[PDB]
Amino acid sequence: MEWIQSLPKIELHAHLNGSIRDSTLLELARVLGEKGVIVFADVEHVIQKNDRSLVEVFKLFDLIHKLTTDHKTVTRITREVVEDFALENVVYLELRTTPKRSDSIGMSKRSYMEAVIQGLRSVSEVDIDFVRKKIYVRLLLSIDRRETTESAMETVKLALEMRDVGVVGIDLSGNPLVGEWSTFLPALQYAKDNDLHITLHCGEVPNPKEIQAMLDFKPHRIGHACFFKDEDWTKLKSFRIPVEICLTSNIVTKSISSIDIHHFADLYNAKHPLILCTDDFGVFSTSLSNEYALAVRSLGLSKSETFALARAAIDATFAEDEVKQQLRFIFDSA
């Protein structure tokens, strides 16, 4: 019910371009149709009933990226996403995004990320700390599974350069059927050796060797873990790696057949760290409050158990100890 919306919450797995307001996406589509760069009726037709199954949803992401890969838009959607999360009482957000290169518009991975920073500086409806509601924001740079080792290294280099504006870690994301772990391991190792924190999209499709190789790398977090086998769970629980749980995402993409069999319940009962996350609240028509409502109903949690779960996410953040202490005070005040 309504008490979940006012619960202080921590979001650790939200993609910038998957978190866009419906109205904003349509406004961008409309402006580009008036320009004739797209046809509004087609782009609206994919937006409406793309299946968002695992295979289908990446075509929607391709389409979104045609609408949003521009400096002004990146700045706008960064502000809108932070404000949307803060207004449902997210008090700490790790926002992840894949820096993009587009030569025709003078966009580099660095200038893309500068537009994100400009968006954070434009936040006005709420108070923000990124290095009246208040939200702490920190940044993850995503490496996409289509990239090369050299390209991944450029992203890691950028992340190190931008630690002064709140970049705290690196993610590996994108189509789980594309690319090989061997391509990304060297760049992720460089990141980890430079004290960046690492989260990995892991087990979105069956892939026993890659799941084991990702676990053996000992990232600080993983996302999803939908197609783990018993040896994978054993290693995960022994390494104590927190899992970013994306309930609606997993169910809509058909990575998990039902919330009633979703592994988040086993993790909860095994006292393994988990954090409820939105993944793409725009694409999947959800919110972090609604993800908690799904979990509270399915597990049968009391208010007190829900508050305890939400608070446990503090020690899984990639934030400095000072920020974690402030989060503890915020939670202990609620």
Active site residues: 204
163 to 146, 153, 214, 271: CA distances (angstroms): 25, 16, 25, 32
Nearest to Zn ion by Cβ — which residue? 279
Residue 322 Cβ, how far from Zn ion at the closest point, in Å? 28
| Binding to Zn ion in span 159-188, by CB under 5 A | none
Select 92 or 281, whichever has its Cβ closest to Zn ion: 281
Select 144 or 279, whichever has its Cβ closest to Zn ion: 279
Select 61 or 112, whichever has its Cβ closest to Zn ion: 61
Select 120 or 172, whichever has its Cβ closest to Zn ion: 172
Binding characters for Zn ion, 253-282, by CB under 5 A (x = yes):
--------------------------x---
# of chain residues touching Zn ion (CB under 5 A): 1
Residue 18 Cβ, how far from Zn ion at the closest point, in Å? 7
d(CA 9, CA 32): 36
Binding characters for Zn ion, 52-71, by CB under 5 A (x = yes):
--------------------
Select 80 or 279, whichever has its Cβ closest to Zn ion: 279
Determine, following the binding rule CB under 5 A, whether residue 291 of this chain makes contact with Zn ion: no
Q: Which residues are annotated as a binding site for N(6)-methyl-AMP?
A: 15, 17, 65, 97-100, 144, 174, 204, 279-280
Residue 15 Cβ, how far from Zn ion at the closest point, in Å? 6
Q: Which residues are annotated as a binding site for Zn(2+)?
A: 13, 15, 201, 279
| Binding to Zn ion in span 19-38, by CB under 5 A | none
Which residues are at the interface with Zn ion (CB under 5 A)?
Answer: 279
